[PDB]
C-alpha cells in the first residue's frame, strides 16, 4: 500500500528547507 | 473583502516603508525550552519576566545566516513579520540583536505542529482537512494581496492554537514581490513543477504548495515521495498523480485543479483569482466568513495543562546560547 510504501521510507519525520 | 484587503494594505504599507527594530534585550526573558531546531537557529519557549507572560523567541546565529548566504531572506522574514496582521499568522512581538544573534519574539502557540498530530493521528478526514484548508485559503488571500509570497508551506510550519486554529509560522523565504522571481526556495516535496525547473515564477507556487498540503492532510501522505529529493523532483515535474480510493470525488477534482502542471490552467492563478478555489464544489460548505471571525466549530483541540506547558512539541537537545564580547555581523544586518 501507498501507505505502507511511505512509512519504511526516509522522509517521514521533519522535512528541512532547502537552501543552497 | 475587496473593501477589506483594501483597508489591509494601507496599515501593512505604513509598516513596510517604517520597519520597526529593537524593541527589547535579551535578559527581559527566561530561556525555558528549545521548541523547534534549524539550520541556523532554534526557537526557545521563552517568559518575559515583567509580564509573566511566554513567547517563542526564535534565535539566528548571525555567522551561520552568512556562511549559509540568507541575509536577504533574514531581513526580509524580520520586515514582513512586523508589518502583516492576520488571524491565523502569528504575531512577532519583538526583535532585538546582540553581538552574537538576531531574535524574533512571536507568540506562544500551544497547540504543537500540525505535522505531530497529523503524523501521530495518521490521516484527517476530509472535513477536517477542510477546516484547515479554509484557513490557508483566506491566508493566502490575503499575503498575495500585498504582493508577497509565501513560499514554504508544510506541517511543519503550521501551528495548532487553543480554540484548534491554525497559526502560519516561519515566513525565511516570504517575499514581496511584483513580477516574477527565481530562488530555488522551499521543502522538495512542496515545490511546484517551475521552481524545480528554473524558470522563474509567482504566486502560483502557494496555490500547487496547498494542493499539496490538503493531499498530505486527507491522505495521510504527501503526492510525491521517495527517498532522495532528486527522485521526488522527477516525480513532481511528471505530472502524473494516483489519488488514494477514499478520496471524494470533488476533492479529486479539487486537487487536479491545484496541482496543474500547465500554470495557465491552474486554481488561483486563472482570470477569477482566489474565487476559482473558495467557489469549487469542495468548499460549497464552507462559511469563509464564520471561519474568519474563529467562529467555525474546530474538529480537534489539542489541549494543554496550562501556560508554559510544552507537551505538544518534541524533545530537543538543549545547547547554550554564546553571545560574542565582539559585535559580530554588523553591516550586513544594520536594519534588522
Ligand atoms: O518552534 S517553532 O519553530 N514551531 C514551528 C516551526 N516549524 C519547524 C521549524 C523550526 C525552525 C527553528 C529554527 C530555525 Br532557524 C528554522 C526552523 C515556532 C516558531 C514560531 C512561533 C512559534 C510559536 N509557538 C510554538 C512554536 C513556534
Known amino acids: 500500500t501507498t501507505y505502507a510504501d511511505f512509512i519504511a521510507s526516509g522522509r517521514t519525520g521533519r522535512r528541512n528547507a532547502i537552501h543552497d | 473583502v ?31 525550552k528549545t521548541l523547534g531546531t534549524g539550520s541556523f537557529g532554534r526557537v ?24 549559509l548566504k540568507q541575509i536577504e531572506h533574514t531581513l526580509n522574514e524580520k520586515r514582513i513579520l512586523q508589518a502583516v496582521n492576520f488571524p491565523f499568522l502569528v504575531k512577532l512581538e519583538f526583535s532585538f540583536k546582540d553581538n552574537s544573534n538576531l531574535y524574533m519574539v512571536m507568540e506562544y502557540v500551544a497547540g504543537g505542529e500540525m505535522f505531530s498530530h497529523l503524523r501521530r493521528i495518521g490521516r484527517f478526514s476530509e472535513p477536517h482537512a477542510r477546516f484547515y484548508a479554509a484557513q490557508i485559503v483566506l491566508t493566502f488571500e490575503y499575503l498575495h494581496s500585498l504582493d508577497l509570497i509565501y513560499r514554504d508551506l508544510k506541517p511543519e510550519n503550521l501551528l495548532i492554537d487553543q480554540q484548534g486554529y491554525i497559526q502560519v509560522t516561519d515566513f525565511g523565504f516570504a517575499k514581496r514581490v511584483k513580477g516574477r522571481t527565481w530562488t530555488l526556495c522551499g521543502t522538495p516535496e512542496y515545490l511546484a513543477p517551475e521552481i524545480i525547473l528554473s524558470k522563474g515564477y509567482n504566486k502560483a507556487v502557494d496555490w500547487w504548495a496547498l494542493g499539496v498540503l490538503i493531499y498530505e492532510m486527507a491522505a495521510g501522505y504527501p503526492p510525491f515521495f521517495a527517498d532522495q529529493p532528486i527522485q521526488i523532483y522527477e516525480k513532481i515535474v511528471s505530472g502524473k498523480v494516483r489519488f488514494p480510493s477514499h478520496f471524494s470525488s470533488d476533492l479529486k477534482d479539487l486537487l487536479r ?24 464544489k469542495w468548499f460549497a460548505t464552507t462559511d469563509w466568513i464564520a471561519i474568519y ?14 501556560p508554559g506547558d510544552t507537551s505538544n512539541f518534541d524533545d530537543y537537545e538543549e545547547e547554550e546560547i554564546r553571545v560574542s564580547i565582539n559585535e559580530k555581523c554588523g553591516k550586513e544586518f544594520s536594519e534588522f
Open chain 2, 44 to 67: 526557545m519557549l521563552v517568559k518575559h519576566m515583567e509580564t509573566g507572560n511566554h513567547y517563542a523567541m526564535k534565535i539566528l546565529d548571525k555567522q551561520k545566516v552568512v556562511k
Open chain 2, 257 to 280: 485543479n491545484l496541482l496543474q502542471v500547465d500554470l495557465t490552467k491552474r486554481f488561483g492563478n486563472l482570470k477569477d483569482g482566489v474565487n476559482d478555489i473558495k467557489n469549487h
Open chain 2, 2 to 32: 475587496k473593501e477589506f484587503l483594501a483597508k489591509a494594505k494601507e496599515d501593512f504599507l505604513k509598516k513596510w516603508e517604517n520597519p520597526a527594530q529593537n524593541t527589547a534585550h535579551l535578559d527581559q526573558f527566561e530561556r525555558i
Open chain 2, 293 to 306: 471571525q474563529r467562529k467555525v466549530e474546530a474538529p480537534f483541540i489539542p489541549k494543554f495543562k496550562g
